[PDB]
Design a protein around this ligand. Sequence first.
Ligand code: MG
Ligand code: MG
Ligand code: MG
Ligand code: MG
Ligand code: MG
Ligand code: MG
Ligand code: MG
Ligand code: MG
Ligand code: MG
Ligand code: MG
Ligand code: MG
Ligand code: MG
Ligand code: MG
Ligand code: MG
Ligand code: MG
Ligand code: MG
Ligand code: MG
Ligand code: MG
Ligand code: MG
Ligand code: MG
Ligand code: MG
Ligand code: MG
Ligand code: MG
Ligand code: MG
Ligand code: MG
Ligand code: MG
Ligand code: MG
Ligand code: MG
Ligand code: MG
Ligand code: MG
Ligand code: MG
Ligand code: MG
Ligand code: MG
Ligand code: MG
Ligand code: MG
Ligand code: MG
Ligand code: MG
Ligand code: MG
Ligand code: MG
Ligand code: MG
Ligand code: MG
Ligand code: MG
Ligand code: MG
Ligand code: MG
Ligand code: MG
Ligand code: MG
Ligand code: MG
Ligand code: MG
Ligand code: MG
Ligand code: MG
Ligand code: MG
Ligand code: MG
Ligand code: MG
Ligand code: MG
Ligand code: MG
Ligand code: MG
Ligand code: MG
Ligand code: MG
Ligand code: MG
Ligand code: MG
Ligand code: MG
Ligand code: MG
Ligand code: MG
Ligand code: MG
Ligand code: MG
Ligand code: MG
Ligand code: MG
Ligand code: MG
Ligand code: MG
Ligand code: MG
Ligand code: MG
Ligand code: MG
Ligand code: MG
Ligand code: MG
Ligand code: MG
Ligand code: MG
Ligand code: MG
Ligand code: MG
Ligand code: MG
Ligand code: MG
Ligand code: MG
Ligand code: MG
Ligand code: MG
Ligand code: MG
Ligand code: MG
Ligand code: MG
Ligand code: MG
Ligand code: MG
Ligand code: MG
Ligand code: MG
Ligand code: MG
Ligand code: MG
Ligand code: MG
Ligand code: MG
Ligand code: MG
Ligand code: MG
Ligand code: MG
Ligand code: MG
Ligand code: MG
Ligand code: MG
Ligand code: MG
Ligand code: MG
Ligand code: MG
Ligand code: MG
Ligand code: MG
Ligand code: MG
Ligand code: MG
Ligand code: MG
Ligand code: MG
Ligand code: MG
Ligand code: MG
Ligand code: MG
Ligand code: MG
Ligand code: MG
Ligand code: ZN
Lengths: 59, 118, 122, 74, 204, 137
Amino acid sequence: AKHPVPKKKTSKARRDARRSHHALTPPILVPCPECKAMKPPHTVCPECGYYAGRKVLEV
Amino acid sequence: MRHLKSGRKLNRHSSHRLALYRNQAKSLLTHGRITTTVPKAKELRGFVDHLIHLAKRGDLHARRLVLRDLQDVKLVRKLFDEIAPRYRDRQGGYTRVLKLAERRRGDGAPLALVELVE
Amino acid sequence: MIQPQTYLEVADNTGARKIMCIRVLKGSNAKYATVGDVIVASVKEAIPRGAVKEGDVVKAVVVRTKKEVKRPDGSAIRFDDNAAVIINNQLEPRGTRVFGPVARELREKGFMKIVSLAPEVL
Amino acid sequence: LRIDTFRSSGAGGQHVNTTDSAIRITHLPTGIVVECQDERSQHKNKAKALSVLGARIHAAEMAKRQQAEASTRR
Amino acid sequence: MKGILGVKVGMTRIFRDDRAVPVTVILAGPCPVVQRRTPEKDGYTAVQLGFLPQNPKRVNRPLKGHFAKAGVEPVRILREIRDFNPEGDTVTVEIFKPGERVDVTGTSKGRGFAGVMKRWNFAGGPDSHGAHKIHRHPGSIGNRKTPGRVYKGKKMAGHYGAERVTVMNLEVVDVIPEENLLLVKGAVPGPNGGLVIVRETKKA
Amino acid sequence: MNRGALIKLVESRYVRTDLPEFRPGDTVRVSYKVKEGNRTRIQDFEGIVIRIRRNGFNTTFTVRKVSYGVGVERIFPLHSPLIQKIDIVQRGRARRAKLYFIRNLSDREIRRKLRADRKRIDKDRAAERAAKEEVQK
RNA sequence: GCACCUCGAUGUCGGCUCGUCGCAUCCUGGGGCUGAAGAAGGUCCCAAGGGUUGGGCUGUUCGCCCAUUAAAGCGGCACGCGAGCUGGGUUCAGAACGUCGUGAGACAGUUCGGUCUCUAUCCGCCACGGGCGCAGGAGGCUUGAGGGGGGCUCUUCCUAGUACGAGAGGACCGGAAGGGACGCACCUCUGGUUUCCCAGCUGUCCCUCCAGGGGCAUAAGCUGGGUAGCCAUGUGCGGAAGGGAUAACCGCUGAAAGCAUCUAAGCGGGAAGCCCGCCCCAAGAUGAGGCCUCCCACGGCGUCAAGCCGGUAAGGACCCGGGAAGACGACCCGGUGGAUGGGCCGGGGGUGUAAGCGCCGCGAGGCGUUGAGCCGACCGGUCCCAAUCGUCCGAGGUCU
RNA sequence: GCAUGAGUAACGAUAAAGAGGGUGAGAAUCCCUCUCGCCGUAAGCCCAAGGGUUCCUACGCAAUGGUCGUCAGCGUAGGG
RNA sequence: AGUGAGGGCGCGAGCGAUAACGUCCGCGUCCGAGCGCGGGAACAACCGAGACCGCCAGCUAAGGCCCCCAAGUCUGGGCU
Ligand SMILES: [Mg+2]
Ligand SMILES: [Mg+2]
Ligand SMILES: [Mg+2]
Ligand SMILES: [Mg+2]
Ligand SMILES: [Mg+2]
Ligand SMILES: [Mg+2]
Ligand SMILES: [Mg+2]
Ligand SMILES: [Mg+2]
Ligand SMILES: [Mg+2]
Ligand SMILES: [Mg+2]
Ligand SMILES: [Mg+2]
Ligand SMILES: [Mg+2]
Ligand SMILES: [Mg+2]
Ligand SMILES: [Mg+2]
Ligand SMILES: [Mg+2]
Ligand SMILES: [Mg+2]
Ligand SMILES: [Mg+2]
Ligand SMILES: [Mg+2]
Ligand SMILES: [Mg+2]
Ligand SMILES: [Mg+2]
Ligand SMILES: [Mg+2]
Ligand SMILES: [Mg+2]
Ligand SMILES: [Mg+2]
Ligand SMILES: [Mg+2]
Ligand SMILES: [Mg+2]
Ligand SMILES: [Mg+2]
Ligand SMILES: [Mg+2]
Ligand SMILES: [Mg+2]
Ligand SMILES: [Mg+2]
Ligand SMILES: [Mg+2]
Ligand SMILES: [Mg+2]
Ligand SMILES: [Mg+2]
Ligand SMILES: [Mg+2]
Ligand SMILES: [Mg+2]
Ligand SMILES: [Mg+2]
Ligand SMILES: [Mg+2]
Ligand SMILES: [Mg+2]
Ligand SMILES: [Mg+2]
Ligand SMILES: [Mg+2]
Ligand SMILES: [Mg+2]
Ligand SMILES: [Mg+2]
Ligand SMILES: [Mg+2]
Ligand SMILES: [Mg+2]
Ligand SMILES: [Mg+2]
Ligand SMILES: [Mg+2]
Ligand SMILES: [Mg+2]
Ligand SMILES: [Mg+2]
Ligand SMILES: [Mg+2]
Ligand SMILES: [Mg+2]
Ligand SMILES: [Mg+2]
Ligand SMILES: [Mg+2]
Ligand SMILES: [Mg+2]
Ligand SMILES: [Mg+2]
Ligand SMILES: [Mg+2]
Ligand SMILES: [Mg+2]
Ligand SMILES: [Mg+2]
Ligand SMILES: [Mg+2]
Ligand SMILES: [Mg+2]
Ligand SMILES: [Mg+2]
Ligand SMILES: [Mg+2]
Ligand SMILES: [Mg+2]
Ligand SMILES: [Mg+2]
Ligand SMILES: [Mg+2]
Ligand SMILES: [Mg+2]
Ligand SMILES: [Mg+2]
Ligand SMILES: [Mg+2]
Ligand SMILES: [Mg+2]
Ligand SMILES: [Mg+2]
Ligand SMILES: [Mg+2]
Ligand SMILES: [Mg+2]
Ligand SMILES: [Mg+2]
Ligand SMILES: [Mg+2]
Ligand SMILES: [Mg+2]
Ligand SMILES: [Mg+2]
Ligand SMILES: [Mg+2]
Ligand SMILES: [Mg+2]
Ligand SMILES: [Mg+2]
Ligand SMILES: [Mg+2]
Ligand SMILES: [Mg+2]
Ligand SMILES: [Mg+2]
Ligand SMILES: [Mg+2]
Ligand SMILES: [Mg+2]
Ligand SMILES: [Mg+2]
Ligand SMILES: [Mg+2]
Ligand SMILES: [Mg+2]
Ligand SMILES: [Mg+2]
Ligand SMILES: [Mg+2]
Ligand SMILES: [Mg+2]
Ligand SMILES: [Mg+2]
Ligand SMILES: [Mg+2]
Ligand SMILES: [Mg+2]
Ligand SMILES: [Mg+2]
Ligand SMILES: [Mg+2]
Ligand SMILES: [Mg+2]
Ligand SMILES: [Mg+2]
Ligand SMILES: [Mg+2]
Ligand SMILES: [Mg+2]
Ligand SMILES: [Mg+2]
Ligand SMILES: [Mg+2]
Ligand SMILES: [Mg+2]
Ligand SMILES: [Mg+2]
Ligand SMILES: [Mg+2]
Ligand SMILES: [Mg+2]
Ligand SMILES: [Mg+2]
Ligand SMILES: [Mg+2]
Ligand SMILES: [Mg+2]
Ligand SMILES: [Mg+2]
Ligand SMILES: [Mg+2]
Ligand SMILES: [Mg+2]
Ligand SMILES: [Mg+2]
Ligand SMILES: [Mg+2]
Ligand SMILES: [Mg+2]
Ligand SMILES: [Mg+2]
Ligand SMILES: [Mg+2]
Ligand SMILES: [Zn+2]
């Protein structure tokens, strides 16, 4: 390794152009069928503790 | 090339990973439900499931095998005398795993609980 | 599976005892030889006053290896030592008596001299 | 005659590892081979080969003359 | 030009005239034709072929109209045998005589990202004697200022396997229609349970 | 669809039954059919089984004997239609299922560390003395 | 030889690895002449498609030699290739001989020793996605423009001991078989591996004294075996056949030029090469292709918009269970109208007679129970556990 | 003074973790117990030189801590 | 004051091998300082010509007048 190094300052228009893909994606969510509060699918709703219509933990 | 192989390493070597599997099995039989990461949980599942169904046999051999992991004499009694007869009429699958809507913090790991069923 | 530098044993009373394969006559660039294959070798060890001498370069054929050889029937066979018969350029035994069994494939490759000289073919 | 250029052998660096200054010449029907990594040139080693091999063929064959002369006189 | 869809089920070996032969067993029959490809309407000649029964509550609408249009109920995969015109409807295993020769097509095993040394068989580095961390690298890839680049097609690391592969001229060792099984002397590409296609070879 | 079954199917019509049971440690004679150019003759081969590796129809096994000062091993498929018959001659007790180590080993050493299995030999008289309950009527 | 770019740097020999281009051809292919009987060889033309071994000596390139070969071709690519390796050579300091100098030192003479820099920004290249486009919306199945791969060769036999030759030797043509190397795939067989699938073992600490287990001795303590998977030494198959246009070369017919000429008009034969043929990519082929089926009229607005809308449609994404698919994405299967993963069960397979007890023995041990016990993936079952419940997106087609 | 490389190397020995309970605005990281692993001629003790409040007690998290931090050899105040 | 590193082309000589984008003189020129403009595809010094600024006006220069690309697929006679 003879230690590679940038040739030229990456231009403004070129770096932002790279960051085209960096943007985030909002969480995906569902009402908890009892409390209608927001909650991610397939997890036990932290508002009550119900999943499959059964109380699962005593929130 | 993981092809058709099925286990898990959990970034732990063989000795460690094994111990982990016990100290979790251990604690699971102790407290009835525990909460770990989704992957540890997915794996751990069958480990306890195997010990339970071993106890369900009842014989000294069975007891002399489960003791090899659980190590503790009393938790062995606890296994055989209360846990296993719960399940004499449910074959296979003695535990459940459920995902937790709240994440971790300083590493944002996903979380899941593992309770045995009734 | 003998190739350059592979030492072999003498199957017969050629005076020779140990040879070391130095080339394999079975192609423009064959990689290894097996049973039925002729190889050119050098005498490394040999008893006094026998025909060939220490340093003779010789033609020989392999009659026993150590890597199990497949058969068309799906049998297989494997001997303990790697062994060969020293022969002339007419590909005749320069010896007169082979010792210890020899792979049937020698017969299948027409080495009728040896397999009769042979104590036991299998 | 077979002429032969090649990189000389020894101490020399960049203008010797990187300059085929060595010569070798071969007289085919006789058999004698001579060479000259003798000097940093090539033309000078060329000729120095082609006159050493001057002797080395004729000054050498004169032995065949005397050998016969001597033996036949004896 | 005959042909037929099927499953690589796995190979073993058998016996013939006191010689042992490696086979490779292939479930194939049956195959309901799905569509004719006219030279007039389509431009060429072939037959859309069905394989493996489909659970109808998974058949979407546009497919269900395709299927019923040739009078044939649901099926899992659809493929084409080019230059084939089946007399009867369903194509069988029975359309091969044992002794005949075939081209098999499969989707080879999936080695994911591949070392040069594996995929392209480069000899890579010397294991001792001085190697600073190239015990397995590809070495040089070019020249110098002329040409001043690397050329297209240069053998390099990347994905290897999981790809269309045909193997030519394979011997139909046997076939049991009653079971729809096929025996092929030798190595068909891809995994057990993988989809294969088999046709009459293009050899003499 | 059972592919596993589908294989067990096909092979079935090559499977022998007649062959005896045996374990490594047993000493055993195998009549084998070979060709000498024209003729097809039956060449025997007895020795200590050293290794049986199982996989159903494809199950195979290895026998090792010394001959004329040098040892041979041969491997036979346990369903080759080219095996005429196989013979128990003697039965031993190995502690393990793969007996390679007896290669790099003497003949008087192998004699003692491979002990004749008196047990399983008795069950053979049991078999054979009761096998004469056909010649009884 | 010159001294035109580079001395605010263009790392020089040889090996390795990867190669690619030239043809003035080393080999196989085609052909003329022969001082070509045949078999060979010589010399010349055509031909670059592929092929072009392994060792001894030396830092070597070169060269010599060993054993083979169809052959062991030469050259260009900064005498290709050190931000790919090496560092024996050579050209730092150290030191010795020969050697020159009173000398310090020196030589192109020799000999021992002598720090080779983790991070790729651009182009290039190998692989993989995201966006948009494809002027209606979608689920499939596809055509092949254009590229890529491949392209080698020997030996024996038959024809026939014939034609040939005094003989020795010994064919054309036509047809058969077995090989070496190389490529692609595969795991039945052989053969590796198989980080806990079984077993034995030593020290030691622990549980519980016996028995029986555990921890550590490696990130498996050591040993002996070992499924599935991944694999080469293991198995399969590949180069073709043939179709067309030609190279040198050989011709038919045929003037100019009464004869004559392969050519000027016309035609025939002809290569491992050329175009197809075989395997692969491939409609970003913006020139955006085709075929089968499925979905439909706009509810309100918009000077000009061929628009912005707003639920839905056939369908698609999310999410979750998963996967011989996989770096991540992507891809494929599946989600209770379920067998996707898990546990259980069974087959297969590995291991090779568990624990407990009874009998034998002072004992170490043995013997029975017992092919027992344990038993990861492979092949299948099986709703016991886990894929609960849900959310989003997507029509309505400018047009002479 | 601010960009570029770039949310990229790196986060400092491959002795190793797991869980329940607790405290707190907030916890993989602080406290408590249970299991697990490592050192054990030290990775445990005790002198000396050097350092000079780092010691104990309360209260506390902006910065220091290669992340977190309710914790600290960090800050405040008292004591010694 | 600066300059006292010149260069290329034509011609005339020496040197060189009637080699070199070689070298050294002589006489011219141009680049140097006209790398401003038109031709020569590109192209310091070859052919045309010495740019003070403006113009959606005219004539020519070398070089060209089938399309890229302004002007003749012009006209008359030949050859390949
Ligand atoms: Mg994102
Ligand atoms: Mg791997
Ligand atoms: Mg599975
Ligand atoms: Mg799996
Ligand atoms: Mg870890
Ligand atoms: Mg090979
Ligand atoms: Mg000697
Ligand atoms: Mg000889
Ligand atoms: Mg072989
Ligand atoms: Mg005999
Ligand atoms: Mg005899
Ligand atoms: Mg020298
Ligand atoms: Mg000199
Ligand atoms: Mg004389
Ligand atoms: Mg690799
Ligand atoms: Mg190589
Ligand atoms: Mg090498
Ligand atoms: Mg049949
Ligand atoms: Mg049968
Ligand atoms: Mg009776
Ligand atoms: Mg070398
Ligand atoms: Mg090499
Ligand atoms: Mg080359
Ligand atoms: Mg080269
Ligand atoms: Mg030539
Ligand atoms: Mg000549
Ligand atoms: Mg070549
Ligand atoms: Mg060319
Ligand atoms: Mg070599
Ligand atoms: Mg060589
Ligand atoms: Mg030399
Ligand atoms: Mg050469
Ligand atoms: Mg070169
Ligand atoms: Mg040069
Ligand atoms: Mg040096
Ligand atoms: Mg020195
Ligand atoms: Mg040196
Ligand atoms: Mg060194
Ligand atoms: Mg990069
Ligand atoms: Mg990049
Ligand atoms: Mg794309
Ligand atoms: Mg085609
Ligand atoms: Mg086009
Ligand atoms: Mg090509
Ligand atoms: Mg004859
Ligand atoms: Mg004759
Ligand atoms: Mg004769
Ligand atoms: Mg022929
Ligand atoms: Mg053969
Ligand atoms: Mg071959
Ligand atoms: Mg275990
Ligand atoms: Mg102990
Ligand atoms: Mg232990
Ligand atoms: Mg092991
Ligand atoms: Mg295996
Ligand atoms: Mg081989
Ligand atoms: Mg082949
Ligand atoms: Mg060919
Ligand atoms: Mg034509
Ligand atoms: Mg004529
Ligand atoms: Mg005539
Ligand atoms: Mg004529
Ligand atoms: Mg012609
Ligand atoms: Mg033709
Ligand atoms: Mg395709
Ligand atoms: Mg309506
Ligand atoms: Mg309106
Ligand atoms: Mg709309
Ligand atoms: Mg998914
Ligand atoms: Mg996945
Ligand atoms: Mg997509
Ligand atoms: Mg399914
Ligand atoms: Mg439900
Ligand atoms: Mg299942
Ligand atoms: Mg399952
Ligand atoms: Mg079994
Ligand atoms: Mg016992
Ligand atoms: Mg016992
Ligand atoms: Mg045990
Ligand atoms: Mg006892
Ligand atoms: Mg068993
Ligand atoms: Mg049993
Ligand atoms: Mg079980
Ligand atoms: Mg298990
Ligand atoms: Mg499964
Ligand atoms: Mg399966
Ligand atoms: Mg980031
Ligand atoms: Mg990232
Ligand atoms: Mg660092
Ligand atoms: Mg807590
Ligand atoms: Mg202390
Ligand atoms: Mg001190
Ligand atoms: Mg200080
Ligand atoms: Mg506080
Ligand atoms: Mg703080
Ligand atoms: Mg803070
Ligand atoms: Mg740091
Ligand atoms: Mg606080
Ligand atoms: Mg403080
Ligand atoms: Mg002045
Ligand atoms: Mg001056
Ligand atoms: Mg001047
Ligand atoms: Mg001048
Ligand atoms: Mg002159
Ligand atoms: Mg210009
Ligand atoms: Mg200007
Ligand atoms: Mg100009
Ligand atoms: Mg200028
Ligand atoms: Mg002027
Ligand atoms: Mg004019
Ligand atoms: Mg113009
Ligand atoms: Mg005209
Ligand atoms: Mg004119
Ligand atoms: Mg006129
Ligand atoms: Zn809720």
